[PDB]
Amino acid sequence: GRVIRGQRKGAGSVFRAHVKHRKGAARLRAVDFAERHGYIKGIVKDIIHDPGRGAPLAKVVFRDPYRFKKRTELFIAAEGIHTGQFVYCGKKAQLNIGNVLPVGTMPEGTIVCCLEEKPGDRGKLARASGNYATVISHNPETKKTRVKLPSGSKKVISSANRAVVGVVAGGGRIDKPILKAGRAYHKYKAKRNCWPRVRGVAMNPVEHPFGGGNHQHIGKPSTIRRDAPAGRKVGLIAARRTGR
Amino acid sequence: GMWRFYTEDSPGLKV
RNA sequence: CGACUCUUAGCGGUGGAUCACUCGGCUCGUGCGUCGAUGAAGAACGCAGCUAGCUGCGAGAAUUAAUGUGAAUUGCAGGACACAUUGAUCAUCGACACUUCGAACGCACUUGCGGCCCCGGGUUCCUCCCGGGGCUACGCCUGUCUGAGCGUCGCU
RNA sequence: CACGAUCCUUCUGACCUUUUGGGUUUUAAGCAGGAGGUGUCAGAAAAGUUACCACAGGGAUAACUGGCUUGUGGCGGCCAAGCGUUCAUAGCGACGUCGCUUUUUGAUCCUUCGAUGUCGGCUCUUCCUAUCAUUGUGAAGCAGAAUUCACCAAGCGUUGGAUUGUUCACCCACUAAUAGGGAACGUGAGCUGGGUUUAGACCGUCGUGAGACAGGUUAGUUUUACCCUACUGAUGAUGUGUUGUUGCCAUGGUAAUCCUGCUCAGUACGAGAGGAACCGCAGGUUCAGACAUUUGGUGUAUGUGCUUGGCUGAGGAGCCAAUGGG
RNA sequence: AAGCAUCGCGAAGGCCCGCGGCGGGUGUUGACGCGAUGUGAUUUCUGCCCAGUGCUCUGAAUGUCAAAGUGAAGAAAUUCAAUGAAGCGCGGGUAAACGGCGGGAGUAACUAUGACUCUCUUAAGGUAGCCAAAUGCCUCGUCAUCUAAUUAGUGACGCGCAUGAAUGGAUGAACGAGAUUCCCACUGUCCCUACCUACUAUCCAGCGAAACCACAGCCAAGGGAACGGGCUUGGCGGAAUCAGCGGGGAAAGAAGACCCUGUUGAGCUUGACUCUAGUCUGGCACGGUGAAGAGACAUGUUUUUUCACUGACCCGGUGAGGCGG
RNA sequence: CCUCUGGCAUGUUGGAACAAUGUAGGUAAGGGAAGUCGGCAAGCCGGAUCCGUAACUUCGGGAUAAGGAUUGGCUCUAAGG
RNA sequence: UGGAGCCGCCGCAGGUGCAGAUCUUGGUGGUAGUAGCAAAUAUUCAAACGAGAACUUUGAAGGCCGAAGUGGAGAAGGGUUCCAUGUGAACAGCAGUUGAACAUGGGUCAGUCGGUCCUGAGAGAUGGGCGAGCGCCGUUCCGAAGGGACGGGCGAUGGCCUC
RNA sequence: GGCCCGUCUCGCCCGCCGCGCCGGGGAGGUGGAGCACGAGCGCACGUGUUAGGACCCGAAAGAUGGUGAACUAUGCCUGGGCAGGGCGAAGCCAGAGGAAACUCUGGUGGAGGUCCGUAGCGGUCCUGACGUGCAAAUCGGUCGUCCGACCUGGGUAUAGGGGCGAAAGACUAAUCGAACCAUCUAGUAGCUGGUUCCCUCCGAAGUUUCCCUCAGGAUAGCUGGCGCUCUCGCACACGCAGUUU
RNA sequence: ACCCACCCGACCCGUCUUGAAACACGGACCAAGGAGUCUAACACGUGCGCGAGUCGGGGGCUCGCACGAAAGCCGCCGUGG
RNA sequence: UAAGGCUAAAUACCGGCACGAGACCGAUAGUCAACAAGUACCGUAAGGGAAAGUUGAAAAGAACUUUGAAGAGAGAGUUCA
RNA sequence: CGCGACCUCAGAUCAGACGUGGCGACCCGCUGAAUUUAAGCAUAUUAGUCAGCGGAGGAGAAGAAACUAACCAGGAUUCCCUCAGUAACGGCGAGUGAACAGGGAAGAGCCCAGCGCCGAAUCCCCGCCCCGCGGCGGGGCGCGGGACAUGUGGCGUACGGAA
Ligand SMILES: [Mg+2]
Ligand SMILES: [Mg+2]
Ligand SMILES: [Mg+2]
Ligand SMILES: [Mg+2]
Ligand SMILES: [Mg+2]
Ligand SMILES: [Mg+2]
Ligand SMILES: [Mg+2]
Ligand SMILES: [Mg+2]
Ligand SMILES: [Mg+2]
Ligand SMILES: [Mg+2]
Ligand SMILES: [Mg+2]
Ligand SMILES: [Mg+2]
Ligand SMILES: [Mg+2]
Ligand SMILES: [Mg+2]
Ligand SMILES: [Mg+2]
Ligand SMILES: [Mg+2]
Ligand SMILES: [Mg+2]
Ligand SMILES: [Mg+2]
Ligand SMILES: [Mg+2]
Ligand SMILES: [Mg+2]
Numbered sequence A: 001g002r003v004i005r006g007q008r009k010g011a012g013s014v015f016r017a018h019v020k021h022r023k024g025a026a027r028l029r030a031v032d033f034a035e036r037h038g039y040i041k042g043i044v045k046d047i048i049h050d051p052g053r054g055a056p057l058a059k060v061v062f063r064d065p066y067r068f069k070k071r072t073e074l075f076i077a078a079e080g081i082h083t084g085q086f087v088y089c090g091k092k093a094q095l096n097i098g099n100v101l102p103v104g105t106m107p108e109g110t111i112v113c114c115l116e117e118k119p120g121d122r123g124k125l126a127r128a129s130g131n132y133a134t135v136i137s138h139n140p141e142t143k144k145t146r147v148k149l150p151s152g153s154k155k156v157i158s159s160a161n162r163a164v165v166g167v168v169a170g171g172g173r174i175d176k177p178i179l180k181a182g183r184a185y186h187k188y189k190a191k192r193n194c195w196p197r198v199r200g201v202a203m204n205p206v207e208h209p210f211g212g213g214n215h216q217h218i219g220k221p222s223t224i225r226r227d228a229p230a231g232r233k234v235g236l237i238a239a240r241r242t243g244r
Numbered sequence B: 001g002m003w004r005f006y007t008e009d010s011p012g013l014k015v
Numbered sequence C: 001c002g003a004c005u006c007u008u009a010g011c012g013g014u015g016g017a018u019c020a021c022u023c024g025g026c027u028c029g030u031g032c033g034u035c036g037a038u039g040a041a042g043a044a045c046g047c048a049g050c051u052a053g054c055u056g057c058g059a060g061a062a063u064u065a066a067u068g069u070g071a072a073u074u075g076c077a078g079g080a081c082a083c084a085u086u087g088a089u090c091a092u093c094g095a096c097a098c099u100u101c102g103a104a105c106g107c108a109c110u111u112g113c114g115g116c117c118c119c120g121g122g123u124u125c126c127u128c129c130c131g132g133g134g135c136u137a138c139g140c141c142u143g144u145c146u147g148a149g150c151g152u153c154g155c156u
Numbered sequence D: 001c002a003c004g005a006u007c008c009u010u011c012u013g014a015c016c017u018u019u020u021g022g023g024u025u026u027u028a029a030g031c032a033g034g035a036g037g038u039g040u041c042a043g044a045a046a047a048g049u050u051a052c053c054a055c056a057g058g059g060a061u062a063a064c065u066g067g068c069u070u071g072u073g074g075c076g077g078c079c080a081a082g083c084g085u086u087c088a089u090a091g092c093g094a095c096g097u098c099g100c101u102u103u104u105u106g107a108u109c110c111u112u113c114g115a116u117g118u119c120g121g122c123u124c125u126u127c128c129u130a131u132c133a134u135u136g137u138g139a140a141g142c143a144g145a146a147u148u149c150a151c152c153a154a155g156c157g158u159u160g161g162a163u164u165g166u167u168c169a170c171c172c173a174c175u176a177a178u179a180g181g182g183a184a185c186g187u188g189a190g191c192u193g194g195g196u197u198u199a200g201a202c203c204g205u206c207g208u209g210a211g212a213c214a215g216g217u218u219a220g221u222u223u224u225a226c227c228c229u230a231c232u233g234a235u236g237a238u239g240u241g242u243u244g245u246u247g248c249c250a251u252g253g254u255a256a257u258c259c260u261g262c263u264c265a266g267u268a269c270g271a272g273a274g275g276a277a278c279c280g281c282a283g284g285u286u287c288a289g290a291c292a293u294u295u296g297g298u299g300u301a302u303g304u305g306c307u308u309g310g311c312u313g314a315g316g317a318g319c320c321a322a323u324g325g326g
Numbered sequence E: 001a002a003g004c005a006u007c008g009c010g011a012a013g014g015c016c017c018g019c020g021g022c023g024g025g026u027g028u029u030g031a032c033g034c035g036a037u038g039u040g041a042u043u044u045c046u047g048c049c050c051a052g053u054g055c056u057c058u059g060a061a062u063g064u065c066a067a068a069g070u071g072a073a074g075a076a077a078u079u080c081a082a083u084g085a086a087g088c089g090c091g092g093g094u095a096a097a098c099g100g101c102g103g104g105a106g107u108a109a110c111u112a113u114g115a116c117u118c119u120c121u122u123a124a125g126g127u128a129g130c131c132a133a134a135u136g137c138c139u140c141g142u143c144a145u146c147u148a149a150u151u152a153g154u155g156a157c158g159c160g161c162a163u164g165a166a167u168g169g170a171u172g173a174a175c176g177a178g179a180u181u182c183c184c185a186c187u188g189u190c191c192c193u194a195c196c197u198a199c200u201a202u203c204c205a206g207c208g209a210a211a212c213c214a215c216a217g218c219c220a221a222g223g224g225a226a227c228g229g230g231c232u233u234g235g236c237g238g239a240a241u242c243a244g245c246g247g248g249g250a251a252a253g254a255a256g257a258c259c260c261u262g263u264u265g266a267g268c269u270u271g272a273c274u275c276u277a278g279u280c281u282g283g284c285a286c287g288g289u290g291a292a293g294a295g296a297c298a299u300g301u302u303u304u305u306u307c308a309c310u311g312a313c314c315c316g317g318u319g320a321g322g323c324g325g
Numbered sequence F: 001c002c003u004c005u006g007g008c009a010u011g012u013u014g015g016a017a018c019a020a021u022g023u024a025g026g027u028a029a030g031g032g033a034a035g036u037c038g039g040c041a042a043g044c045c046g047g048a049u050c051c052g053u054a055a056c057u058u059c060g061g062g063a064u065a066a067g068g069a070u071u072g073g074c075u076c077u078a079a080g081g
Numbered sequence G: 001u002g003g004a005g006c007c008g009c010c011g012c013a014g015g016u017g018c019a020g021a022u023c024u025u026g027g028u029g030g031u032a033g034u035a036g037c038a039a040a041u042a043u044u045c046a047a048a049c050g051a052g053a054a055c056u057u058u059g060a061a062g063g064c065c066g067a068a069g070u071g072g073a074g075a076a077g078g079g080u081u082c083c084a085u086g087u088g089a090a091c092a093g094c095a096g097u098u099g100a101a102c103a104u105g106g107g108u109c110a111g112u113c114g115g116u117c118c119u120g121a122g123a124g125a126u127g128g129g130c131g132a133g134c135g136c137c138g139u140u141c142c143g144a145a146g147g148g149a150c151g152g153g154c155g156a157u158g159g160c161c162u163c
Numbered sequence H: 001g002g003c004c005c006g007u008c009u010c011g012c013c014c015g016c017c018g019c020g021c022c023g024g025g026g027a028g029g030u031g032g033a034g035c036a037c038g039a040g041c042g043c044a045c046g047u048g049u050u051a052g053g054a055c056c057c058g059a060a061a062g063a064u065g066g067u068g069a070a071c072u073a074u075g076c077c078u079g080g081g082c083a084g085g086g087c088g089a090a091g092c093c094a095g096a097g098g099a100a101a102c103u104c105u106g107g108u109g110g111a112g113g114u115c116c117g118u119a120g121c122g123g124u125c126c127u128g129a130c131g132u133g134c135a136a137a138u139c140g141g142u143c144g145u146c147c148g149a150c151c152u153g154g155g156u157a158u159a160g161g162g163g164c165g166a167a168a169g170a171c172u173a174a175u176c177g178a179a180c181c182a183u184c185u186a187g188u189a190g191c192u193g194g195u196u197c198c199c200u201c202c203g204a205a206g207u208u209u210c211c212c213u214c215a216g217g218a219u220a221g222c223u224g225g226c227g228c229u230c231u232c233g234c235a236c237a238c239g240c241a242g243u244u245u
Numbered sequence I: 001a002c003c004c005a006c007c008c009g010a011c012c013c014g015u016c017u018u019g020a021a022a023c024a025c026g027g028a029c030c031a032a033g034g035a036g037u038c039u040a041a042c043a044c045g046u047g048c049g050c051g052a053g054u055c056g057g058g059g060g061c062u063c064g065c066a067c068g069a070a071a072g073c074c075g076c077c078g079u080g081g
Numbered sequence J: 001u002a003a004g005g006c007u008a009a010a011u012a013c014c015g016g017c018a019c020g021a022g023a024c025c026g027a028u029a030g031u032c033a034a035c036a037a038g039u040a041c042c043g044u045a046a047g048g049g050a051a052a053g054u055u056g057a058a059a060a061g062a063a064c065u066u067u068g069a070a071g072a073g074a075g076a077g078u079u080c081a
Numbered sequence K: 001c002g003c004g005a006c007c008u009c010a011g012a013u014c015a016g017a018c019g020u021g022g023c024g025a026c027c028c029g030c031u032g033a034a035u036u037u038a039a040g041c042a043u044a045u046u047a048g049u050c051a052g053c054g055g056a057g058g059a060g061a062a063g064a065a066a067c068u069a070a071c072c073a074g075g076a077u078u079c080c081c082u083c084a085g086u087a088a089c090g091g092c093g094a095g096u097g098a099a100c101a102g103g104g105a106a107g108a109g110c111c112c113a114g115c116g117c118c119g120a121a122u123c124c125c126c127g128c129c130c131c132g133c134g135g136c137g138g139g140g141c142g143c144g145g146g147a148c149a150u151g152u153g154g155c156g157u158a159c160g161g162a163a
């Protein structure tokens, strides 16, 4: 019968992200002669809170090296950053915390965050709240490097691509219980319309494959193909193993 | 015309 | 017989059938076969001595001019006119005119903001200020001017 | 009796026809006979569910009532083998048999599907008798007491509660007795809505599932009378010349009920245990018809005090607070 | 709903929109995230079953498997051959995936039950718990308790028609316009009704509707489409009205929601029949350069394998700001 | 709940009665849920001060638990800047 | 009665005959002078006007709303309902001397109160892309997307070409 | 009996520019909507049967293209709103005890999807009023909540097999298990209902076989109408029967 | 034919139905409207014309059509059916 | 003789302008519309969508008297009525 | 590091033109159902039909054979009669369904590219004069611009054409 919640999310409208009070996209600096060859220094003017983001950001002010002009950036704050700190960045950047250098330079066992997945992308992996990647090992020829992400996957990467040293700030956020529904409500009110979530079993059988029945049961296996048309693809999508 | 009975009243109900 | 009720008739009411009319339709046929940036169709707002509606018209607004016609128009006024005079009234319509939206065109739809040329007050080009006029849509064609390119060459 | 049309397919058959401007050869199409099947067998290619439901209709068809029927249920005879210490028949009654009843349930499908409101309870009237009690009596295996059996008989009665939606059931208690039934399984414009029997939900079982369940659970709108009649009361009506009076009475209706105590009497009767009755007297129950002297209830005589908050400057006199409160 | 627990996804990605786009939402995001499910605070637990249906993992070792391409004979349409992707099959994993979780016999020096033993059988055979519960047919189960009396309530029992573990089991303070049961108090709920007040109803002035209506309107019985206002046979019948009343008009209402028929439908479902967006795979096309080599056939051809390259094509960044020599 | 400022004419009419049924309010002897499916409905309770407070509990609660006492008027006293 | 057209015969032609269709449109009954004009405590006395007063107005008294108002001002919506004078046909479910009715006239004055300007969520042209197509997508993305400014120079005119 | 065309069976002869896998006949069966001295064509009227809106009125549906979020659902932007009490969380102070650890006592403090309770928001029970209403869902009392997943104005977003849904198949302008508006559309109906003047004559059937047939058709039967061919009461009859012999 | 009396007879129509006065449905009353049509195709019957033919269309020739969008005629008279 | 192009005529015509006619309809008919009709009115909007003709030849449309607050009457008069 | 050709591309309120919307009976191009019929239904049918979008004209479209035929042959298109409810299609069911010939209405035929020849022999726009001017045209005259050899004009196009 109906289009199920899930399918409607793609259309946007009501399920678009709430983004008025968000401070900006949380990127690294753009590459340039300075970053590519030496190091550009910039100070941390303030640390901020960004709605719908666990991590804190940092307003970091550089000087544009072509026009007399003080550019500014929004880094994801590595934990241990403070205001009135200097943040150095580039190839000849030193290996301390809050210091974006190319993964290639930094040694094995180096902890990083806001890691560029591709060179020049301005910081894509491991940038949540208490998260970090680890540089495993370099392959000098091929100019490539191996990195262990937060998920536990070990991804290969161009030595060129950069990442900030140290973990992300605002760690352990998920340790505190929420307790109140309201405290959940307020969390997702800063993000998007995704919260008080009705179980498919409760729904009639027009608004969910699991719906209907004189008992709240599923009635078909809750695992499912991922060669599955959007509508059925519900429950445990291509679940390799399902249990505890 | 006059209202008479509600829709779910169905006056002479003999199920 | 008394009142009431019923029936029938007379007259009267209620109601608007029937009949009789018909500046309306419906159908068939004939001829022509024409809209619009030179601003259409449509919409809006206006316009009469007294006029609300319909119709008619556009700030020249129940119409101007012209031509034909030849004494009205008429609900009441008032008037005109010498109806032996371009001359009332109608008709025709070739000249003139035609508010604002609208393809809708300076940009916006508040009826709001503008730019650029010329003119009058205002100055004595002092720019202001006010008023008036004329331009200021997109697309595309032919040409025109100014240009761009480590596009292809030449001469220096 | 042991079997199958069109269309399609397949095979077989002839020096066969056509395969299109002509000719050769493949191919295809024809013609004629078999075979491949339609068992819903004169021959569609086809799974559920709906309580979220809809439409056209149907009393050609169910779920009430009411009809017929009466198997089944209930009630009642005949016969008499037995029981009854003895004795078929006081009271019973086998094996058989004949009936009635429509307060059981079935059969049935006549009536109603442009709808006859679907269980119970409450309330109220009336009718029946197949009589529990009470009146009058016949019987006994009736000494008395208690008693069953039968007759006239439906006048009068036939209750209060615990559980349950219940009908039904059971138990407590009282009683004279706690008999049984009918009236559209009396009675929803009388109520109620606890239950069945929409929609929400829960559980179990069943179903892959949607969903199902005379399986359990909880939540869930009960409309209209002012018409006619009926009944209740209320004015009136024709007659008698008019009016009043005091009256008669046709017809309708109708009412009383049952119990206890005392006495008879510890008497009859009885071995005793136990244990009556008639006439009297004193009272009570249920019902009926009145009434307010008394007791009680009401009370806005807004009667008279008392009191809260406020308001007429205060006193006094009052008012307001949907009847200020008492 | 927090809490718990699963699942997918490292971005040319997961999930999803869109008729289409170098389209879009999540995403101003990056696993302490986004997406998809279940269960439902805490406490305490969460047994066994991978046989079935799902999901998933691997894959020349391999059954089948299409179009193209390759060979074959044929005059050609062609037929035949080999070749062979996903998917099925084959083989593992998975139950906080859908779900599922037994039946006989005999046995203890009174009897009874049966610790014990014997079989037959499954993928195991219901573990911990819990119970005649909102789940128990029989059923008003039995025993206790609560009452003078209890198909009710509570506590036990368990044989459980048909309880049971995130289809969550067992618990549980606080809370609940939630479902029951009893007690205290309180009461017109009742015995059993009464009186009082206001607004109505009532009568008048003024004003003034509607539904409904074949004709109408007293009964008994009869017969009748098997319950009559009318018909038959009886009883009977007296103008015009008022306030009431709910017996009857099988009163009004709405072309029965029930039930059945119709070759009438819709909503939903799936192992119905027929399709389809999407998705997965294979072919041809845009599609190039060089290197190496390798088989297969033949005595050059085809198949190409792997490794580079960059010029198409794609992606990212930037105010295209220092690129390679 | 009563009042001033300000605002109204009792909500589309009046009059006369004071029957039954109603709608909305009250009160009831003795009993006290015997009523009913069921305490439905109404009634009890209620404010403050002072005492006093159980089971159970996630130790927070439960809790206004429950159960008691007092409360006016007047005339003083003491204590707080 | 009515006041202008109409008929017989022979042929032809039809939108040719009504009691029903819960028929269609219009009209009228009985019901019926009936149901009814019962939510939110409340009225009374005098005078005035007037044909006429339960209801208008004035005065007096008694009442209510009781500053979370039945008071005083706005928003949206209405659109002349505002104010005055006059009318008593209709309407205002009795009445009316009254009214938001009807008929005549009147009435809204801003540099400062608001629109107007800004951006918000969003909407939406161009470039580009898609699209059989009306178009759609898209809003910074596959753009040669700035027409402005200062200072200098050179030219031209307009001016006591001085400045 | 005969003839023609198909078809079979059997048989014996003819023909010539081309003698042949040529052509032509015969006899006897058997298929044909055939011939056997023609009856059609045109026009008109009637009845019947169809195809069409098709006697009239009637669905539930289906499709195409548009209008709506002024109600309500949810997101976003910007504004506004929420007496008086109770309980008394962390933090802090003092004092007392403790040898230390720290503990007690009295305060202060004002936490909370905390309690009562107004406005606001809601809508439990009376199964109260009303039920041709004040009202196409209102009124009274009684209730739930009242600093938060709180209430609310304006703006803006999402549109019909679509939206939105703390999930009731709820809501989407009194409409929702698929909105409204117009068209396709006079949709189809084996089923309800209706179907208009007079007289005259005749006058049925509910059975047959077949049918996705059993509320319907087909086919026989039963009816009517039109006729024709003959017959003879015109002293001059053959045939037939719901009999009997 | 208007009214009234009396005796006898006599239930309300329409409709589906085996069966309706029905406790079956539709119907308060009156007016006007209101449902077997037209086209095509077939069939049989009947009337008329011609008859191994028949035919008329379609076209053409004759008029501005008053009556005419008729009527008449055509080696088209028969391409053709 | 394809992969390029132009071309009058007979043919179509429920819109338009301007005419003509009818075995049509005759105000519940005929167009929704004989009339101030796509009007009034309704709906947020798409959209829906009415009713409604007739004095008489001529206004000669009732001067005047009188009752009444008036509406309404009674006489008088106009008209063939 | 200039200046100059061209090529490809920009910008102009540059000079002068055109297109945009409406109407929609008829016409051309797409798009395209489902009621419905089949007594069910899915192919079929309804139907290349309604709705949707686009573009016209007084008509449009079509049109001068890559045609019919198989004859002793006809000879663009369109229209009417006929072919014909035929050949054919089709759960070969329901249903659908043309064409050629024949007779009429009308009647009309042509032009390029190419291949070639001819001093680009051609075109557009400027500017001055004479006429003409309410459908911007003729004639003349300008070392006045441009278009054009990446091809303009005359001859010529299958019926043959050129010399
Ligand atoms: Mg649900
Ligand atoms: Mg589904
Ligand atoms: Mg299951
Ligand atoms: Mg050939
Ligand atoms: Mg259900
Ligand atoms: Mg059921
Ligand atoms: Mg129905
Ligand atoms: Mg029956
Ligand atoms: Mg029965
Ligand atoms: Mg014996
Ligand atoms: Mg009844
Ligand atoms: Mg007896
Ligand atoms: Mg009963
Ligand atoms: Mg009754
Ligand atoms: Mg009732
Ligand atoms: Mg109930
Ligand atoms: Mg239910
Ligand atoms: Mg009354
Ligand atoms: Mg005093
Ligand atoms: Mg799970």
Ligand SMILES: [Mg+2]
Pocket (backbone or CB within 6 Å): none
């Ligand atoms: Mg488990």
Ligand SMILES: [Mg+2]
Pocket (backbone or CB within 6 Å): E050
């Ligand atoms: Mg498995």
Ligand SMILES: [Mg+2]
Pocket (backbone or CB within 6 Å): none
């Ligand atoms: Mg166990």
Ligand SMILES: [Mg+2]
Pocket (backbone or CB within 6 Å): none
């Ligand atoms: Mg009890």
Ligand SMILES: [Mg+2]
Pocket (backbone or CB within 6 Å): none
């Ligand atoms: Mg128990």
Ligand SMILES: [Mg+2]
Pocket (backbone or CB within 6 Å): none
């Ligand atoms: Mg289980």
Ligand SMILES: [Mg+2]
Pocket (backbone or CB within 6 Å): none
């Ligand atoms: Mg379970």
Ligand SMILES: [Mg+2]
Pocket (backbone or CB within 6 Å): E229
């Ligand atoms: Mg009757």
Ligand SMILES: [Mg+2]
Pocket (backbone or CB within 6 Å): E248
């Ligand atoms: Mg009654």
Ligand SMILES: [Mg+2]
Pocket (backbone or CB within 6 Å): none
């Ligand atoms: Mg009824």
Ligand SMILES: [Mg+2]
Pocket (backbone or CB within 6 Å): D057, E255
């Ligand atoms: Mg019906």
Ligand SMILES: [Mg+2]
Pocket (backbone or CB within 6 Å): E263
């Ligand atoms: Mg059938």
Ligand SMILES: [Mg+2]
Pocket (backbone or CB within 6 Å): none
């Ligand atoms: Mg269906």
Ligand SMILES: [Mg+2]
Pocket (backbone or CB within 6 Å): E266
């Ligand atoms: Mg549907």
Ligand SMILES: [Mg+2]
Pocket (backbone or CB within 6 Å): none
């Ligand atoms: Mg299948």
Ligand SMILES: [Mg+2]
Pocket (backbone or CB within 6 Å): F010
């Ligand atoms: Mg009052």
